[PDB]
């Protein structure tokens, strides 16, 4: 007996409740993942004078949190186009911007860079109340975060260290007991459960920066990508423990990492190519697809069923199909391109970039909502000397 995969059976069975199965779940979403990219249209938002958006996640069907190079943390109501700023959490001590935002699997805790970029800030969801202090575990900025459980998060940094943090019930109850007594919010205290550095390779021993993290829930692995071109895999069942290290086929701008749970494949961005790695495979068994957007860099990547969505410095999003092993074509690779957003004609632009009226808004972050039909895209100009933001909702 062959597998019944036809969507006509799903529709006609649904009309009868004739066991329209959960078997079709991968058919329905896989079909949508191929259809959506050509149906999307841009609705830009005006964020004012914020510097760049570096991280973003959906908090609700209606709201997206965004972190910025200005260190501002803010929320967009994408239905009303309304911007709400959030207080930035300070450290245990009275001593860049927000390069990473992450949600724990149960969506009760949000993890961001703090007022100190070296320090992890935790907020309570959905309210955005503070939970705990900015720490002093890292000596430099937090580049990436990954919630390996509802209580445990790993955080990378420019010094190459990986802090493992656990928000225990005590941390929550101390935050809540303190906020009920003191009208001014007072944090709970935190420290890393363990602090481990990535193995130092023959490459520059200071350039051990861990730029991206991704969690494989199936095997309880944490994958990690450094900017020296090396990929690392760690077991994350209970505590951060090394499994293997593999050198990536490309060692340039390895800034984003995503994991396809339906493929057991890690997608790794680079200055030009997306690489598809499987740590259980031989090191030569790696697929590499060239974006051809050469010189602009891949800046964000994610899996939607069997489709990879790739944001780039050419302010453009490509879509790639694993099963077909090629880009989606337009109804000639299909690509969206961001609008102009807003640029600040500041002194640096005046001196070095004044000869250019328009720059592409690099997609530093993108994410699909829970329905799988809306794609939030945000970023800013590629050059570090340029100040100005871009955001919009594609639907």
């Amino acid at each position: 007996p062959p597998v019944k995969r036809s969507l006509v059976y799903y529709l006609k069975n649904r009309e009868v409740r004739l066991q329209n199965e959960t078997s079709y779940s991968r058919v329905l979403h896989g079909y949508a993942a191929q259809q959506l990219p050509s149906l999307l249209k841009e609705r830009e938002f005006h964020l004012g004078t914020l510097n760049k958006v570096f991280a973003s996640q959906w908090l609700n069907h209606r709201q997206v949190v965004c972190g910025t190079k200005c260190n501002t943390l803010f929320v967009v109501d994408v239905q009303t186009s309304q911007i709400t700023k959030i207080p930035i959490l300070k450290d245990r001590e009275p001593g860049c911007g927000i390069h990473a935002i992450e949600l724990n699997p149960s969506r009760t805790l949000l993890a961001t860079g703090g007022d100190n970029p070296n320090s992890l800030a935790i907020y309570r969801l959905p309210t955005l109340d503070p939970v705990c202090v900015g720490d002093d575990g890292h000596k430099d900025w937090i580049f990436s975060i990954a919630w390996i459980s509802d209580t445990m998060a790993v955080s990378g940094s420019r010094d190459g260290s990986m802090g493992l943090w656990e928000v225990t019930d005590d941390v929550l109850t101390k935050s809540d007991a303190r906020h009920n007594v003191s009208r001014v919010p007072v944090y709970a205290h935190i420290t890393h459960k363990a602090l481990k550095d990535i193995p130092k390779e023959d490459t520059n021993p200071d350039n051990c920066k861990v730029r991206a993290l991704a969690f494989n829930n199936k095997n309880k692995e944490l994958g990690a990508v450094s900017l020296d071109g090396y990929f690392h895999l760690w077991k994350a069942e209970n505590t951060l423990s090394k499994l293997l290290s593999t050198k990536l086929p490309y060692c340039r701008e390895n800034v984003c990492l995503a994991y396809g749970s339906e493929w057991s494949v890690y997608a790794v961005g680079s200055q030009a190519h997306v690489s598809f790695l499987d740590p259980r495979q031989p090191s030569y068994n790696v697929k590499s697809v060239c974006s051809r957007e050469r010189g602009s860099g891949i800046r964000s990547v994610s899996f939607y069923e069997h489709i990879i969505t790739v944001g780039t410095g050419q302010g453009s999003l490509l879509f790639y199909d694993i099963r077909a092993q090629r880009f989606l074509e337009e109804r000639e690779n299909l690509k969206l391109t961001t609008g102009k957003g807003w640029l600040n004609h500041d002194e640096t632009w005046r001196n070095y970039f004044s000869d250019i009226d328009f720059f592409p808004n690099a997609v530093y972050t993108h994410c699909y909502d829970s329905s799988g039909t809306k794609l939030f895209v945000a970023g800013g100009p590629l050059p570090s000397g340029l100040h100005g933001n871009y955001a919009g909702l594609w639907s």
Partner: protein
């Protein structure tokens, strides 16, 4: 903002759960049945199922279980809704009042959790220590059954096994013990745990994990003395208990999947098993009793009993009777015999319960072309598939018809003094009288001795002292029953002709001009007592006996020719007790006094078809509680009748009506008759409890059906219908349907059973070449079930299958429309089809076929190949608009009779639904909600105007008006979009706003514009405007209509007030129940009035009505607001009850 009123026209009928136990008492056996939101409680009796109580819960029922904690005298009932409201319910009766009392309740939803893929499961331990609920993967939620746990507080035990298929509590274990089948990467396994309430965790179970059949699914816990568990797969049945394992694999079960079970014997010796095809099996456990006193299973045996309706749940009741609850067809009560029949089956049907569900399609038509509307639905699936013809009003069976034109009235007579049955029926004609002899069911024209043949009879009937009376224009004649001869005659002193007459057991009243004469009936003698003169000429009079009186009445009701009024006179003196003005332009033609459920009422009808009815106080002759209902446009005649063991009133008109009482309230329903002028009751030895209805040309003799708001007629197809449309030109319905055939070793396919598509009066097969160039790689596989599709052409009058046309191999007929195209005067049936193969996620090939039905032959006019499946088609301005996969396309009909593409739209994921009005197209998407397109004839293309950006999985769509669009979604929620006329920017204009959200609790298959009550024909006095019917998978029919702002505010205020007075079962908040709900978001209901709640205002007693009304400001239409009285909302609500 849009304002919409939504009400249920037909309650859901498909069963989704059933249980048996001692719930209403410690002694009675009950069957509790759950149909979506409705809980129905029956008492099991030797005769059948006797309903006691029915309850609408503010929630869709998912779990329903009877249980009995220690110290309870009778079972308690646990219910969990799909919104996770949980409650424990107790049934209590005090005197005549029955209430369902919530002992405990609480919402048991968890903020995080994947809802489990085998659906909600809920189970109760055999000693009632806990309820265990499998709501989410990886978690087992336990509710301790502490008698003090008034709030259903619960804790979760984490479960290592994520994907759990079925779970049961085992019997005989000391600790409550959970046994379940779960699916590992290595296959399916049986595992057990002991459940600790003190530690709130799982402990190692009493026996080891076992591998089981890969298709193992259903788990049957086995009671003592056996203990253990039976596991049921696709091929085998296995028993596990401790170390013992015992398995059988009967070939007799391998053909169909077992879907449900029910324990026959309290000791576990026999179980019923049911399956996908409706085959009912008995599984028997052969036991060996050992010399040490223990009991062990010896072997398992499976036997086939026969076929039933497809079972959703079985329940063995008692005495061999099984309730076969069915979701896909009519539910059945069946009896199991010891000895098989000639066909080898032991199953004999006892009773059948109508199920409209699932309603996959419908249309509203006027077969009588009257403009009322009857609704014809595609219902059921597989061998249960049928058409149902649904019509608001009361049915009649014609048993005889006689050519007797010009009848001016009818009356029964019993000429044989030894008979209670009618033996004679008198026919009134102008200038003559004729008599029908009644001999069984046979009826013949004759003459009755003592009666005048050359005069018009205005009344006759049986009277006291074993005599008959005939009242004719010239005289009043008393005729004895024996020897059928005149005994006395009375004549009017002024020698004027009688125009109206009425008589009972002893009283005679005749109207002669303005004079009313009263006579007494004595043995062989008539006597005049008194007479009066009315101010105006009498148009009608009635002295029909009331209540339990022995054919007597102290009152006479009359109507007049001049002042258009009704009056009550006291006999014999004809004293005026009450005068009531009827109004209108046309005089009363008939007046009637009747008794409804022992209550006394007066009815009077005008020649304009208007009917006025009043409560009647006999002692004082006064009228009260006056109400007006228009029945027709022609003069109406009011008469009593006896049938269904009750007394009621029939109104003869161009729109004949039966007036009947329910719960001491009058209900007026149209009758399924073309026309009636006069009538009388009939009670012969062949026609007991019957009617004689005289129309313009013939006399119709017959019986009334059960008095139901909607009458339903069933036409079984024995195969699944898919779409229906009506072609008036050919007097035919077109129905897409399909049957399952099994592919044999010959490579061909054979039908499992005969069905409408093979049993047709003629048939044809698609002779198309279009897809001959390619075949599926699995086209030659064996044993695979293949669905074979047909277009049936069905006679509108007989419902016979006039023709059946078969589609290609592997071709699905998806959509059907009947319309005229272009300038072509021919009406065509247009079918959209698709080629379907299991290995393809989406179809790449399909075609549109234009058929014409003429001279008994369905002819193919044209074929068009399309690269995709045709999901929907509509007629759009003489052009054919079709949804093909992800695109919407518009076809022009050429003079060569071929379709030609003009324009299209590509902005969809999958366009499943199409509705149009004017130049506007509403398109429903698989995932992206609804979008609005418009056709621009000047450019010859489509332009997208606005769309809803809130993602929604559409099940149906409809256009309510130009700006307001109605959607239905997979999660049982209805919503209204509105074009944003307030928009000032382009981005705002392109967004449709949600101006209403409402959780309906049904999956809606189809929306249709129409009504089952007579259309308004331009009247604007109705507070509601527009009428959209909809059908659901549970067989529920609902109605949506629009409200003006003032009505919306009045009813919304009233709605919030009702929710503070009427306490629901389970104590579930109405605002929570109706709030829009999905995995992604929850929102309060707005823009919609719950008509099922508003109408409940007429059920609550006045003491509670006054609580709702007090301090409410009401606009009486003057524009001024005044404090409302109880009867102000009653009037408003009763008007709302007339829309369905």
């Amino acid at each position: 903002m849009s304002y919409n009123y939504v009400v249920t026209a037909q309650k859901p009928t498909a069963v989704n759960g059933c249980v048996t136990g001692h719930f209403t008492s410690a002694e009675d056996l009950n069957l509790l049945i759950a149909k979506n939101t409705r809980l129905e409680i029956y008492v099991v009796t030797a005769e059948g199922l006797r309903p006691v109580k029915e309850v609408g819960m503010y929630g869709k029922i998912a779990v329903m279980e009877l249980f009995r904690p220690k110290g309870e005298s009778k079972d308690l009932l646990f219910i969990l809704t799909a919104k996770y409201n949980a409650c424990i319910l107790e049934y209590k009766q005090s005197g005549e009042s029955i209430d369902i009392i919530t002992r405990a309740h609480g919402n048991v939803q968890d903020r995080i959790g994947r809802p489990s893929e085998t659906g909600i499961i809920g189970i109760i331990d055999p000693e009632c220590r806990m309820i265990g609920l499998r709501l989410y993967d990886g978690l087992f939620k336990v509710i301790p059954l502490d008698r003090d746990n008034k709030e259903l507080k619960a804790f979760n035990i984490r479960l290592e096994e994520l994907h759990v298929i079925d779970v049961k509590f085992l019997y005989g274990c000391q600790a409550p013990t959970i046994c379940f089948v779960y699916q590992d990467p290595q296959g399916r396994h049986v595992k057990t745990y002991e459940v600790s309430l003190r530690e709130k965790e799982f402990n190692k179970g009493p026996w080891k994990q076992e591998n089981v059949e890969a298709e193992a699914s259903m788990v049957i816990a086995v009671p003592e003395p056996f203990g253990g568990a039976i596991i049921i797969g696709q091929e085998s049945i296995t028993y596990h208990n401790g170390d013992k394992y015992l398995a059988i694999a009967p070939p007799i079960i391998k053909q169909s999947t077992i879907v449900c079970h029910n324990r026959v014997d309290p000791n576990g010796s026999r179980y019923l098993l049911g399956d996908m095809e409706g085959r009912l099996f008995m599984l028997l456990l052969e036991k060996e009793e050992q010399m040490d006193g223990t009991v062990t299973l010896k072997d398992l045996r499976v036997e086939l009993l026969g076929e039933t309706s497809i079972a959703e749940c079985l329940t063995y009741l008692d005495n061999g009777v099984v309730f076969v609850g069915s979701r896909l067809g009519d539910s059945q009560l069946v009896k199991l015999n010891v000895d098989s029949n000639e066909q080898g089956s032991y199953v004999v049907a006892m009773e059948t319960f109508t199920n409209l569900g699932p309603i996959v399609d419908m249309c509203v038509v006027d077969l009588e072309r009257q403009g009322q509307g009857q609704l014809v639905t595609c219902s059921g699936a597989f061998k249960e598939g049928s058409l149902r013809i649904i019509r608001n009003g009361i049915g009649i069976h014609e048993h005889a018809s006689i050519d007797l034109p010009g009848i001016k009235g009818l009356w029964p007579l019993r000429s044989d003094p030894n008979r209670e049955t009618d033996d004679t029926l008198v026919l009134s004609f102008v200038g003559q009288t004729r008599v029908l002899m009644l001999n069984g069911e046979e009826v013949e024209e004759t003459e009755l001795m003592g009666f005048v043949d050359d005069q018009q009879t205005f009344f006759c009937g049986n009277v006291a002292h074993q005599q008959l009376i005939q009242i004719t224009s010239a005289s009043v004649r008393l005729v004895s029953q024996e020897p059928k001869a005149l005994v006395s005659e009375w004549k009017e002193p002024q020698a004027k002709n009688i125009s109206v007459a009425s008589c009972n057991s002893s009283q005679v009243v005749v109207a002669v001009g303005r004079a009313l004469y009263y006579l007494q009936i004595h043995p062989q003698e008539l006597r005049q007592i008194s007479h009066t003169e009315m101010e105006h000429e009498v148009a009608c009079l009635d002295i029909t006996p009331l209540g339990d009186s022995n054919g007597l009445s102290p009152l006479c009701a009359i109507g007049l020719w001049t002042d258009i009024s009704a009056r009550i006179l006291k006999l014999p003196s004809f004293e005026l007790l009450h005068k009531e003005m009827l109004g209108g332009e046309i005089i009363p033609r008939s007046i009637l006094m009747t008794t409804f459920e022992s209550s006394h009422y007066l009815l009077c009808a005008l020649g304009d078809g208007a009917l006025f009815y009043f409560g009647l106080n006999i002692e004082t002759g006064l009228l009260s509680d006056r109400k007006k209902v228009t029945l027709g446009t022609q003069p109406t005649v009011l008469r009593t009748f006896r049938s269904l063991s009750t007394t009621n009133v029939f109104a003869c008109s161009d729109r004949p009506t039966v007036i009947y009482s329910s719960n001491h309230k009058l209900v007026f329903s149209n009758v399924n008759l073309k026309e009636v002028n006069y009538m009388c009751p009939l009670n012969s030895d062949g026609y007991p409890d019957s009617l004689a209805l005289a129309n313009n040309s013939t006399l119709t003799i017959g019986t009334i059906d059960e008095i139901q708001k909607l009458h339903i007629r069933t036409v079984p197809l024995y195969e699944s219908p898919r779409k229906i449309c009506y072609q008036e030109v050919s007097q035919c319905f077109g129905v897409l349907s399909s049957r399952i055939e099994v592919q044999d070793t010959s490579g061909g396919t054979t039908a499992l059973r005969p069905s409408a598509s093979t049993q047709a009066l003629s048939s044809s097969v698609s002779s198309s070449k279009l897809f001959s160039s390619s075949t599926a790689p699995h086209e030659t596989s064996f044993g695979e079930e293949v669905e074979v599709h047909n277009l049936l052409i069905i006679d509108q009058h007989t419902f016979e299958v006039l023709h059946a046309h078969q589609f290609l191999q592997n071709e699905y007929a998806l959509s059907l429309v009947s319309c005229k195209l272009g300038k072509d005067p021919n009406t065509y049936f247009i079918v959209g089809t698709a080629m379907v193969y299991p290995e393809e996620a989406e179809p790449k090939q399909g075609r549109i076929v234009v058929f014409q039905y003429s001279d008994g032959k369905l002819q193919t006019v044209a074929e068009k190949e399309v690269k995709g499946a045709v999901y929907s088609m509509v007629e759009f301005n003489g052009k054919l608009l079709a949804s093909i996969n992800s695109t919407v396309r518009l076809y022009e009909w050429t003079t060569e009779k071929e379709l030609r593409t003009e324009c299209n739209h590509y902005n969809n994921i999958m366009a499943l639904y199409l509705k149009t009005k004017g130049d506007f197209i509403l398109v429903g998407d698989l995932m992206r909600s609804v979008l609005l397109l418009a056709y621009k004839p000047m450019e010859g293309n489509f332009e997208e105007i606005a769309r809803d950006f809130n993602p929604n999985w559409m099940s149906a769509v409809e256009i309510l008006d130009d700006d307001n669009f109605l959607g239905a979604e997979n999660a049982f929620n209805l919503f209204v979009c509105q074009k944003d006329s307030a928009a000032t920017t382009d981005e705002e204009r392109q967004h449709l706003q949600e101006v209403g959200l409402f959780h309906l609790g049904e999956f809606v298959n189809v929306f249709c514009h129409g009504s089952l009550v007579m259309q308004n024909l331009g009247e604007t006095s109705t507070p509601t405007q527009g009428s959209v019917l909809f059908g659901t998978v549970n067989g529920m029919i609902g109605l949506v209509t629009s409200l003006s702002e003032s009505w919306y505010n009045l009813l919304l205020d009233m709605q919030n007030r009702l929710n503070k007075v009427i306490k629901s079962v389970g104590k579930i908040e109405h605002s929570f129940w109706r709030s829009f709900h999905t995995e992604r978001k929850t929102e309060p209901a707005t823009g919609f009035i719950d008509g099922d709640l508003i109408e409940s205002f007429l059920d609550i007693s006045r003491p509670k009505m006054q609580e709702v009304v007090a301090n409410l400001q009401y606009d009486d239409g003057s524009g001024m607001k005044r404090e409302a009285t109880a009867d102000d909302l009653i009037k408003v609500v009763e008007e709302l009850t007339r829309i369905h």
